[PDB]
Ligand binder design. Structure first.
Ligand SMILES: N/C(=C1\C(=O)C(=O)N(c2ccc(O)c(C(=O)O)c2)[C@@H]1c1ccc([N+](=O)[O-])cc1)c1ccccc1
Ligand SMILES: N/C(=C1\C(=O)C(=O)N(c2ccc(O)c(C(=O)O)c2)[C@@H]1c1ccc([N+](=O)[O-])cc1)c1ccccc1
Lengths: 5, 228, 228, 5
């Protein structure tokens, strides 16, 4: 999965 | 509710104690109780609220993915996998609904523009999480996009391109374009633009938050590296 | 209760699914429901039960220590730290009482000798956990010691000195002597004896569990190294 | 803390 914040 | 007889300031204290104890469900419950006192949240309080709930749904999403993958390979039997996946899914939706209700009922107002970017990003995030498990759904996608878009428009005007909330918003919105709305080109463009414009105006970094800007800008590249 | 309408075998399946999802509270709830079907547990089922609950109380103990340390440095103010510590403490005691009730109500019987060592070790462990937070208490210490001692006597006679349950029992009992009963010399002796006698009869290792024996024997040395 | 299993 890609990065989120 | 269950926090109603406690002083607001004690709720904030206990939220911080729960964070130190890594008790994020308690942390979220304390912050929810504090929001229900009716008073606007400080910048610090907003971020305590977000940390708590994002940590709770994060574990639920991770759990949900583990079961969904098993369920997917089961279909290539017994109903137990679907049932348990459905149980964790129903739980996840409950927390998302709890946060979204709190955002419209109490937090989103009137308030400053930075305030509004923070809350609107949360609105888009938790709508995105519901979209990750929904079907039948695109009503949820539209409301995620609309919350994100309004947050973008405000932030382009009111915040420097290195602000961590602005950078995090674009990062998450880009991922939304990619994994949710199935628009890789729009996801890539937004992430390249967001990163490039932050470097063009690197001088706007702030002493109090430049470490958060550095990190989110590396994450924007990590996603680009991942999508090439 | 809430698991009463589900097939025993589905409960076992879902316990394994929850473990894969790292949902140990669900895992414990499924196993509890399975024990309440009235049937003796297999060796595998016993260890699923133990893994679930030991993982749940482990996080509660870790949380409780974090707050107890803060509370201790607060006393050198406000009541919020004590209150939250007390809240997590009351929760911990509830789970320990839930397991100990299940052991006497259902599991401890009649059954084989290996069975009895497993359950009696759990009895001593969860009594030890209640002693870690109790005061006023030594009633809890006595029942931890008595459960441990009976488990030792049976295991000396019925299990080789390399059996992982036997080794784990002595490891935990040694720690009990040290941190609970305040008898470092007895804790050290039991751990040295336990390790030495396992090496003397290293040939009794089993193909199916020698990796678990190797690990627990290193842990016995880690504690000795720590107590010299 | 010491080791337990
Ligand atoms: N836990 C973190 C934060 C804080 O604790 C916090 O108070 N920050 C913050 C920093 C600068 C601001 O100017 C604001 C605001 O004006 O509110 C707030 C961090 C923050 C960064 C990015 C987002 N985001 O994109 O959502 C939220 C929070 C965190 C740090 C890096 C990555 C992810 C999370
Ligand atoms: N999760 C673990 C186990 C299993 O999953 C499991 O089924 N094992 C086991 C192995 C051999 C036996 O012969 C028995 C029995 O006869 O029951 C059971 C492990 C086991 C080792 C030690 C204890 N202990 O000391 O309590 C319990 C379980 C674990 C492994 C190393 C350290 C701590 C836990």
């Amino acid at each position: 999965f890609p990065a989120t914040v | 509710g269950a926090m109603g007889s406690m002083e607001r300031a004690s709720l904030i204290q206990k939220a911080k104690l729960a964070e130190q104890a890594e008790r994020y469900e308690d942390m979220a419950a304390f912050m929810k109780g504090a929001v229900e006192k009716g008073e606007e949240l400080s910048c610090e309080e907003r971020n305590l609220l977000s940390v708590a709930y994002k940590n709770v749904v994060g574990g639920q999403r991770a759990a949900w993915r583990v079961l969904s993958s098993i369920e997917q390979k089961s279909n290539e039997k017994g109903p137990e996998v679907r049932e348990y996946r459905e149980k964790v899914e129903t739980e996840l939706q409950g927390v998302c609904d709890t946060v979204l209700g709190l955002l419209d009922s109490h937090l989103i107002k009137a308030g400053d523009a930075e305030s509004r970017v923070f809350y609107l990003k949360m609105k888009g995030d938790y709508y995105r999480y519901l979209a990750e498990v929904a079907t039948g759904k695109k009503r949820i996608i539209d409301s995620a996009r609309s919350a994100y878009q309004e947050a973008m428009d405000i932030s382009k005007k009111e915040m420097p391109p290195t602000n961590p909330i602005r950078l995090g918003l674009a990062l998450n919105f880009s991922v939304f374009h990619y994994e949710i709305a199935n628009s890789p080109e729009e996801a890539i463009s937004l992430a390249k633009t967001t990163f490039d414009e932050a470097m063009a105006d690197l001088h706007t970094l702030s002493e109090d938050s430049y470490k958060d800007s550095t990190l989110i800008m590396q994450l924007l590249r990590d996603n680009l590296t991942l999508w090439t």
